[PDB]
């Protein structure tokens, strides 16, 4: 029992991600500079927005990141 | 129902922390270079070791970090 959304961000280090709560919107921004991988070189950037449900206080929204590279944003329901 | 230890690492960015599982030991290493804060300048380093309980498979150990600056290391019991 709680609001929760998950996002696969394994291509981004925690420092390349920012989570912000603006009004009743959760904003997740990810950006990394050109980086070498198995296939060549790559840079990535995304901006994701979630609507916070009415029964969830935006002030109580927190987040966590797993060693899996999964970002979780969650909050208690009121 | 699950093995879990928490560690307050709010003074360290995720990239300044490393979690390693060696045998049945969880190793958490934190280190940050000299950094300005409210009181002056500070560098910190710690090395913490936890014993993994017998009924916990070390291979299934994962971790996560909260926006609170709390590091959690956890694993299912077998």
Author numbering:
A (entry chain A), B (entry chain A): 73 to 150
What are the paper's exact sentences on this?
Small Hsps (sHsps) form large oligomeric assemblies with a high capacity for holding onto nonnative proteins that are handed over to the ATP-driven chaperone machines for refolding. sHsps are ubiquitous among the kingdoms of life and within mammalian genomes occur in large families with members differentially expressed in many tissues including muscle, brain and the eye lens. Small Hsp sequences have in common an “α-crystallin domain” (ACD) of around 90 amino acids, with most having a short conserved C-terminal extension bearing an I-X-I motif and a longer variable N-terminal extension. The ACD is an immunoglobulin-like beta sandwich comprising strands β2–β9, and the assembly unit is a dimer. The conserved arginine in human sHsps is on the β6 + 7 strand at the dimer interface, not far from the dyad axis.
Here we have solved the X-ray structure of the ACD dimer of human αB R120G close to physiological pH, as well as higher-resolution αB ACD wild-type controls. Two mutations improved the diffraction resolution of crystals of human αB ACD: L137M substitution and truncation of the β2-strand. The highest-resolution structure was solved from a β2-strand truncated construct, αB ACD L137SeM (residues 71–157). The RMSD between the high-resolution 71–157 αB ACD (2 Å resolution) and the R120G ACD (2.5 Å resolution) is equal to 1.589 Å2. The sHsp wild-type ACD X-ray structures all have a deep groove that runs down the AP dimer interface. The groove is maintained through sequence changes, register shifts and across a wide pH range. The base of the groove is lined with four arginines, Arg120 and Arg116 on each of the β6 + 7 strands.
